[PDB]
Amino acid sequence: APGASIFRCRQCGQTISRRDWLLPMGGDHEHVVFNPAGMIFRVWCFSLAQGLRLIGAPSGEFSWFKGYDWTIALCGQCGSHLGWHYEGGSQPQTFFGLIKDRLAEGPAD
Ligand SMILES: O=C1CC[C@H](N2C(=O)c3ccccc3C2=O)C(=O)N1
Ligand SMILES: [Cl-]
Ligand SMILES: [Zn+2]
């Protein structure tokens, strides 16, 4: 009966990822970053996620992760901006950077 197994969208409950899929990029699964508008994000990196909708074509502009291009990842249910999908890089080729405070963590179902 673990209570820290599954990450859901904090706004609607859509299943998004799992603690087991946490990915330590550059030695840490947590990355604190700012965008050009100055917003600060505490981003958790995951190997896999589901329940998202990836919007548009990838861009390398302002990428927080060297060698990766990003696409916006919205909750596929409610449209809440949950983070980004990264692609085009090496080891791994792709991963997800999701905004920790926009997810709710809980037991598996
Ligand atoms: O890796 C990334 C993900 C995208 C993120 N980003 C944003 O959060 C944003 C908002 C508005 C205009 C442009 C951007 C942008 O590049 C950013 O700054 N770096
Ligand atoms: Cl936030
Ligand atoms: Zn949602």
DSSP of the chain, one letter per residue?
--SSSEEEETTT--EEEEGGGB--BTTBSEEEEE-TT--EEEEEEES---SEEEEEEEE-TT-SSTT-EEEEEEETTT--EEEEEEES-SSSS-EEEEEGGGEEEE---
Can you give the length of the chain in residues? Answer: 109
Cα 27–chain centre separation:
17
User: In 3D, which of 41, 39, 38, 16 has the Cα closest to residue 30?
Assistant: 41
Q: How far from the centroid of its chain's Cα atoms is residue 11's Cα?
A: 15
| Specified resolution (Å) | 1.7
Residue 38 Cα to ligand 2 middle (Å): 12
Distance between Cα 81 and ligand 3 center (Å):
8
Calpha distance 66→81 (Å, rounded)? 22
Q: How many angstroms separate the alpha carbon of residue 101 from the centre of ligand 2?
A: 6
Nearest Cα neighbor of 82 from 43, 56, 25, 108 is 43
Residue nearest to atom 16 of ligand 1 (CA): 62
- 45 has binding-site annotation: no
